[PDB]
Design an enzyme around this catalytic site. Structure first.
Site, PDB file in Angstrom:
ATOM      1  N   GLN A 133       0.823  -1.205   0.000  1.00 61.70           N
ATOM      2  CA  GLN A 133       0.000   0.000   0.000  1.00 61.70           C
ATOM      3  C   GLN A 133       0.859   1.258   0.000  1.00 61.70           C
ATOM      4  O   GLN A 133       0.499   2.260  -0.631  1.00 61.70           O
ATOM      5  CB  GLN A 133      -0.956  -0.015   1.193  1.00 61.70           C
TER       6      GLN A 133
ATOM      7  N   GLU B 250       3.678  -7.951  17.562  1.00 65.33           N
ATOM      8  CA  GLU B 250       4.569  -7.188  16.691  1.00 65.33           C
ATOM      9  C   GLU B 250       5.971  -7.016  17.263  1.00 65.33           C
ATOM     10  O   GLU B 250       6.935  -7.045  16.476  1.00 65.33           O
ATOM     11  CB  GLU B 250       3.951  -5.822  16.379  1.00 65.33           C
TER      12      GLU B 250
ATOM     13  N   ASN C  45       4.653   4.531  12.906  1.00 69.99           N
ATOM     14  CA  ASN C  45       3.265   4.868  12.599  1.00 69.99           C
ATOM     15  C   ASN C  45       2.684   5.851  13.607  1.00 69.99           C
ATOM     16  O   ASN C  45       1.822   6.661  13.252  1.00 69.99           O
ATOM     17  CB  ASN C  45       2.409   3.602  12.544  1.00 69.99           C
TER      18      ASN C  45
ATOM     19  N   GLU D  98      25.789   6.191  -2.462  1.00 70.83           N
ATOM     20  CA  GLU D  98      26.005   7.481  -1.820  1.00 70.83           C
ATOM     21  C   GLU D  98      25.141   7.666  -0.578  1.00 70.83           C
ATOM     22  O   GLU D  98      25.438   8.545   0.239  1.00 70.83           O
ATOM     23  CB  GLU D  98      25.747   8.608  -2.823  1.00 70.83           C
TER      24      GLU D  98
END
Ligand SMILES: Nc1nc2c(ncn2[C@@H]2O[C@H](COP(=O)(O)OP(=O)(O)OP(=O)(O)O)[C@@H](O)[C@H]2O)c(=O)[nH]1
Ligand SMILES: Nc1ncnc2c1ncn2[C@@H]1O[C@H](COP(=O)(O)OP(=O)(O)CP(=O)(O)O)[C@@H](O)[C@H]1O
Ligand SMILES: Nc1nc2c(ncn2[C@@H]2O[C@H](COP(=O)(O)OP(=O)(O)O)[C@@H](O)[C@H]2O)c(=O)[nH]1
Ligand SMILES: COc1ccc(CN)cc1OC
Ligand SMILES: COc1ccc(CN)cc1OC
Ligand SMILES: [Ca+2]
Ligand SMILES: [Ca+2]
Ligand SMILES: [Ca+2]
Ligand SMILES: [Mg+2]
Ligand SMILES: [Mg+2]
Ligand SMILES: [Mg+2]
Lengths: 340, 421, 54, 438
Positions: D15, D183, D206, D254
């Site tokens: 998403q 989680e 989040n 870089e």
């Protein structure tokens, strides 16, 4: 119904704040490991600030300013004054200090010796103190080498103001409270921790004012004032009867100026204005006064205690302006706000 | 296409199962003959979770009706939505189980199990990706209890990696058919502890007290008790049968609810339980109130390991978040502190029939141990005198098998007790 | 407060401002981890089947 | 011109990738069908955008992207959405059932059976590259696929593309927008097997994006669409130098050189300003000094932490819009005297500055308002270790009771992999403290 946790069992100040909070019936105490708390009365060393302000829906408050140790450490306070332009190295209210690392470990050994050699040559008083008092630089440096921690050498005030009768030394303790908004409030009630021994500038470290050194090694404890503690009401009446001046004029203006100068200095480093949690903290400022009625800053304490006679009023004030101001409940203030 | 195969076994199993399909069939717009007649595409969004599509746009439940006597299933086939069930999906015997766990598990039930599994296999083979199974039954009788657990043991053998959930009705002396219900329940709990992933405990005592004390029903009937179970089963399955930001099948929902394999017995709850509007705070206070729970276990007598809350209807999701945090932050001593954020909330814009909004509570609380303490106590009062044991030993069972089930349930209790401290 | 390495083009520019100077597993080993985990699952499903056979 | 392949794994990755490529197309003037009227070399060319878009003879501009998910409902959106024509079907890969928020299930059980298919599709995109630089990997920490399958993919990428660089955009778990209790397990498991594989990782908390949406955008209950459109803005600011003419961060190597002087500390902090609500009557456009100074406010950081109490190893300012070098240095001079910016002794106190004149592109009808100048700051602070600390704490709380461990063991993972992964997090926090505190 707000919730708080207690992580410093050895806190006589917040042991009363916790006792008063519960007395309001609107504050509930949780286990020390419970994260769903509004107020954290946290520990002294290694307070987990990184875990505050991340509980959904919970406005969290802590009783310590992350970074305030820069002000409450002998070596950091010295480094803060010598390098912070707000204070400048020419600061007139802070004793000439130096950071001296033991030789078993930047360092200011050579810079301290250059000034020391200038006094000995200029017939000027050259008595220093390392901090666990000497006028010879050899003994000072040799004492720090015998220890394994960082030390600071600062000038020893050889002309301290003495109280009468007694000819005795003392120091002033002021309690300062900074709230989440960074208002600087000075508790109207100070204390003088006096020495019950006549000051002797020719020698024994008892007449030169801690409550533990006076109540242990001093043999006149509790003679003049109870507990070697003289409060402002008496000390002011003495300044008027003896010097013909007030405590507000001769000493208190300089104290309010030092508190402001230090706290406003570190504000950009410790402010929680735009932070995800809020901070407040109670400080203990220790000053010295010389015979010219000039105030000097000794040190600042980040976990200070309060005089027994003042535990009630001050702790109640911590709740009013520091806790309830963020978590309201369902005068004639005891603090002197230092605007800025 | 995450399909769920449903099974209902025995009298209580089929009566409750019947009201379940009756309730969600009305929510998905399916009429008694299986034709859709709704108005929102959200109804057909996840319709295949519980329904198979037939010719002519018909929707036939994915249900298998099992019993050892024809009595109850005859009523279903002649009931309101009787015509909706696949006719072949009725598998029934004739001898009955005489409220005897052994008959359902070993003798009568064993003679009939394979033909039931042939039908399960038929429904699974039509699934694009089987989510898992769900069984409705009581534990105090013979069929749903004895044969119900026999089926569970064989489904775990043929589908070892599919989720096996049950809706298990626990017996209570206050609503009792026979004195042997403690025997049958203990023997079943032994099976469930081992062979199911999740069990929704429904205590008939809680159902009665709700109908009597709360709903003010003088003489409650099984019909009244089954309305509460319908609403709770519909609420528990709301997020499986409708869309939403939640993207979770049975397994993902189990992983987040079950920290320890054996402690998988949930307390279900429903709110409300008449024309007044119920505010979001009121939904939350009731949903967490013991009186609105069906396990008959006071949660304040334990600690929540994990909590799932499903709100239904159009409401301020901002206000829901505030109220959930309020209940948590105001009762943080009833949540284990070693599982951060163990209270989750889901919303659904489609409310149940006749309700502007509602809440379904799913709790994994250690207070459930009190339900097993009741059964264990009643079990021992008879077993220490071997009373009524001949009904079971006459079917080939040994006392040892009883002593083992007893010991497994007592361990389960002592296990709940260590995580409660 | 020195600027260095100033590059300009039609779509932008870039530079550097200096304020102060200073003071694996192989494809074989992966297949083993993946197959070892698969074997522990087989052994755990065998004991489950062995249990159901008793 | 050197190509960059983007890989989006799991729901969060897919998403977010949708919100980036939607933005990349608006930025490079590419339509949903893949056409680009501005491109005058049809079916080819080695321009700046060609690092991210391949070309067909028919003039289609196809993203050099691959989408991977173990369950199909999320990628099916891409297959029927506005930009359903940008990607060809090979680029979108889906399974039948997910990892159920179980790292072990995404890494071992399911991942084993689909790793060769993904690598085969990636090998196809690599064959269309004349000089592949590396990969940009998007995923969540908490998802079973995002954590589990990503770490497996990262391991194989180092084996099949040893001389290529790998950038990560990792979503850090926030309880406010998550229903996953486990989680912390998945986050730390994925960081253990992926630490020695990523060259530069951008964490996005989040909770940070959630509060920016509520505070600055006046979104009461932000959705994934709101979060992702904002996350794509920052990601766009970070990958712009690869897609536009310039000299700062020209290639993926870089990023390591300018942001990661120490290998094991490769998590830069991202800060972005300004975020203005499109629904505002009309905002007074901020200046260079004001947006630059905002980069030193925690409320604009992608990860909540206090940079005043860490030490900087590298600082990179990326401007988009009406910005001139004179105004940048002027703002920097004022911030040094006011802010608390302490660099490590073994690193220079300095800032690499990149200006792109094209102001930020905003999705029409989105939430963000058009602005005349924006800046994204990339700074490697030891303060970001606060985020790891929070996670480690939650991990320790549950692992002490072994809560939820059986789910992972049941998928073939050995319990010791937990503590072995946790001990690697203890090693990581030891480096951050050797580099920051005195
Ligand atoms: N910012 C953002 N975060 C997301 C999004 N989708 C999911 N997440 C976060 O990702 C975490 C859950 O992981 P997912 O990506 O949904 O799981 P997955 O990668 O699909 O793997 P599975 O477990 O198999 O479903 C939660 O913390 C969510 O908050 C998204 O679209 N945007
Ligand atoms: N520069 C100086 N000149 C004269 N006397 C000094 C001095 N510095 C300290 N003192 C004496 O030492 C005492 C303060 O000691 P200091 O505060 O350094 O020790 P400490 O920190 O353990 C006590 P506190 O509880 O206030 O922190 C004062 O009473 C003062 O008399
Ligand atoms: N809630 C509810 N409980 C029931 C119903 N019928 C039976 N029971 C309970 O289930 C137990 C009896 O099991 P039953 O289903 O009749 O036995 P079976 O037909 O052999 O499976 C007893 O504890 C009853 O109280 C019902 O319709 N609703
Ligand atoms: C939000 O929905 C649920 C949450 C938790 C459970 C229990 N594993 C089941 C659910 O739906 C059947
Ligand atoms: C509403 O509650 C939930 C929703 C989804 C999941 C699956 N991640 C778990 C939940 O509760 C544990
Ligand atoms: Ca027979
Ligand atoms: Ca071209
Ligand atoms: Ca590498
Ligand atoms: Mg001290
Ligand atoms: Mg019966
Ligand atoms: Mg997913």
């Amino acid at each position: 119904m707000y919730t708080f946790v207690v992580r410093d069992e050895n806190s006589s100040v917040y042991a009363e704040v916790s006792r008063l909070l519960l007395a309001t019936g609107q504050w509930k105490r949780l286990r020390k490991d419970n994260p769903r708390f509004n107020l954290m009365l946290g520990e002294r060393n290694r307070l987990p600030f990184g875990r505050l302000g991340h509980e959904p829906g919970l406005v969290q408050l802590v009783n310590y300013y992350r970074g305030a140790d820069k002000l409450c450490r002998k070596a950091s306070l010295v480094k803060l004054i010598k390098t912070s332009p707000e204070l400048s190295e020419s600061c007139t209210w802070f004793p000439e200090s130096y950071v001296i690392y033991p030789t078993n470990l930047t360092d200011e050994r050579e810079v301290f010796l250059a000034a020391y050699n200038r006094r000995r040559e200029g017939r000027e008083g050259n008595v220093w103190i390392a901090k666990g008092i000497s006028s010879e630089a050899s003994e000072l440096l040799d004492f720090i080498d015998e220890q394994g921690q960082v030390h600071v050498i600062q000038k020893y005030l050889e002309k301290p103001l003495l109280l009468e009768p007694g000819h005795r030394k003392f120091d002033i303790r002021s309690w300062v409270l900074v709230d989440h908004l960074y208002n600087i409030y000075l508790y109207r009630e100070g204390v003088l921790r006096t020495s019950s021994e006549p000051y002797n500038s020719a020698n024994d470290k008892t007449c030169h004012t801690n409550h533990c050194i006076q109540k242990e090694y001093s043999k006149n404890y509790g003679r003049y004032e109870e507990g070697n503690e003289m409060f402002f009401e008496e000390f002011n009446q003495y300044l008027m009867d003896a010097l013909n001046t007030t405590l507000e004029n001769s000493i208190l203006l300089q104290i309010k100026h030092i508190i402001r100068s230090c706290l406003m200095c570190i504000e950009p480093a410790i402010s929680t204005k735009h932070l995800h949690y809020q901070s407040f903290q109670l400080f203990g400022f220790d000053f010295m006064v010389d015979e010219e009625l000039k105030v000097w800053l000794i040190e600042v304490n980040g976990a200070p205690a309060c005089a027994q006679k003042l535990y009630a009023e001050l702790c109640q004030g911590i709740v009013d302006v520091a806790i309830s101001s963020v978590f309201p409940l369902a005068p004639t203030s005891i603090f002197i706000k230092l605007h800025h | 296409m995450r399909e769920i195969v449903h099974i209902q076994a025995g009298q209580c199993g089929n009566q409750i199962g019947a009201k379940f399909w009756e309730v969600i069939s009305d929510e998905h717009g399916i009429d008694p003959t299986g034709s859709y007649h709704g108005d929102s595409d959200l109804q057909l969004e996840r319709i295949n979770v519980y329904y198979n599509e037939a010719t002519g746009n018909k929707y036939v439940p994915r249900a298998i009706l099992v019993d050892l006597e024809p009595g109850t299933m005859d009523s279903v086939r002649s009931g309101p939505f009787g015509q909706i069930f696949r006719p072949d999906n009725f598998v029934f015997g004739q001898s009955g189980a005489g409220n005897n766990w052994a008959k359902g598990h070993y003798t009568e039930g064993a003679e009939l199990v394979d033909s039931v599994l042939d039908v399960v296999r038929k429904e699974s083979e039509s699934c694009d990706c089987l989510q898992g199974f769900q069984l409705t039954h009581s534990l105090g009788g013979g069929t749903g209890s004895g044969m119900g657990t026999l089926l569970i043991s064989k489904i775990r053998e043929e589908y070892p990696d599919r989720i096996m959930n049950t809706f298990s009705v626990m017996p209570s002396p206050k609503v009792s058919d026979t004195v042997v219900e403690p025997y049958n329940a203990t023997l079943s709990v032994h099976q469930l502890v081992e062979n199911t992933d999740e069990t929704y405990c429904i205590d008939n005592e809680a159902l009665y007290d709700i109908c009597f004390r709360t709903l003010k029903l003088t003489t409650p009937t099984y019909g009244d008790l089954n309305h509460l179970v319908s609403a709770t089963m519909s609420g528990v399955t709301t997020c499986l049968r409708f869309p939403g930001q939640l993207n979770a099948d049975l397994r993902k929902l189990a992983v987040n609810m079950v920290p320890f394999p054996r402690l998988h017995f949930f307390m279900p709850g429903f709110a409300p339980l008449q024309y007044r509007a119920l505010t979001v705070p009121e939904l939350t206070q009731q949903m967490f109130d013991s009186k609105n729970m069906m396990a008959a276990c006071d949660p304040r007598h334990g600690r929540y390991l994990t909590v799932a809350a499903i709100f239904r209807g159009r409401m301020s999701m901002k206000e829901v978040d505030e109220q959930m945090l309020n209940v948590q932050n105001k009762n943080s001593s009833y949540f284990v502190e070693w599982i951060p954020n163990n209270v989750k909330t889901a919303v659904c814009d489609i409310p149940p029939r006749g309700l502007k909004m509602s809440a379904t509570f799913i709790g994994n609380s250690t207070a459930i141990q009190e339900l097993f303490k009741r059964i264990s106590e009643q079990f021992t009062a008879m077993f220490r005198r071997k009373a009524f044991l001949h009904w079971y030993t006459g079917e080939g069972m040994d006392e040892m098998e009883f002593t083992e089930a007893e010991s497994n349930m007592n361990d389960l209790v002592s296990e709940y007790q260590q995580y409660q401290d | 407060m020195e600027v260095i390495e100033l590059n300009k083009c039609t779509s932008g520019q870039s530079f550097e401002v200096i304020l102060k100077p200073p003071s694996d597993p192989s494809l074989e080993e992966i297949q083993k981890k993946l197959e070892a985990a698969e074997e522990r699952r087989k052994y755990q499903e065998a004991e489950l089947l062995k249990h159901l056979a008793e | 011109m050197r190509e960059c392949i983007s890989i989006h794994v799991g729901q969060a990755g897919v998403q977010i990738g949708n919100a980036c490529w939607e933005l990349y197309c608006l930025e490079h003037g590419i339509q949903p069908d893949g056409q680009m009227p501005s491109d005058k070399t049809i079916g080819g060319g080695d321009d700046s955008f060609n690092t991210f878009f391949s070309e067909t003879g028919a003039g289609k501009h196809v993203p050099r992207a691959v989408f991977v998910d173990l369950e199909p409902t999320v990628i099916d959106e891409v297959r029927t959405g506005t930009y359903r024509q940008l990607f060809h079907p090979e680029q979108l890969i889906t399974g039948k059932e997910d990892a159920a928020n179980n790292y072990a299930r995404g890494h071992y059980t399911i991942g084993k059976e689909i790793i060769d298919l993904v690598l085969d599709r990636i090998r196809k995109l690599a064959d269309q590259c004349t000089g592949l630089q590396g990969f940009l990997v998007f995923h969540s920490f908490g998802g079973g696929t995002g954590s589990g399958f990503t770490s497996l993919l990262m391991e194989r990428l180092s084996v099949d593309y040893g001389k290529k660089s790998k950038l990560e955009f990792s979503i850090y778990p926030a309880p406010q927008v998550s229903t996953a209790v486990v989680e912390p397990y998945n986050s730390i498991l994925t960081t253990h097997t992926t630490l020695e594989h990523s060259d530069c990782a951008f964490m996005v908390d989040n909770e940070a994006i959630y509060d920016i949406c509520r505070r600055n955008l006046d979104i009461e209950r932000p959705t994934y669409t709101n979060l992702n459109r904002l996350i794509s803005q920052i990601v766009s600011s970070i990958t712009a130098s690869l897609r536009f003419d310039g000299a700062l961060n020209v290639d993926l190597t870089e990023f390591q050189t300018n942001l990661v002087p120490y290998p094991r500390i490769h998590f830069p902090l991202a800060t972005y300003a300004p975020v203005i609500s499109a629904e505002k009557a009309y905002h007074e456009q901020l200046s260079v000094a004001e947006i630059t100074n905002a980069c030193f406010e925690p409320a604009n950081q992608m990860v909540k932490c206090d940079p005043r109490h860490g030490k900087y190893m590298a600082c990179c300012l990326l401007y988009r819009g009406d910005v001139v070098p004179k105004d940048v240095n002027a703002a920097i001079a004022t911030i040094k005297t006011k802010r608390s910016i302490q660099f490590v002794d073994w690193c220079p106190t300095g800032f690499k500055v990149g200006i792109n004149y094209q102001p930020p592109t905003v999705v029409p009808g989105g939430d963000l308002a058009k602005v005349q100048r924006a800046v994204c700051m990339l700074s490697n602070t030891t303060a970001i270790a606060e985020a790891w600390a929070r996670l480690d704490h939650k991990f320790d709380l549950m692992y002490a009771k072994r809560a939820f461990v059986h789910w992972y063991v049941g998928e073939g993972m050995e319990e010791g992999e937990f503590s072995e992964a946790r001990e690697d997090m203890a090693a990581l926090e030891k480096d951050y403290e050797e580099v920051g505190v005195d």
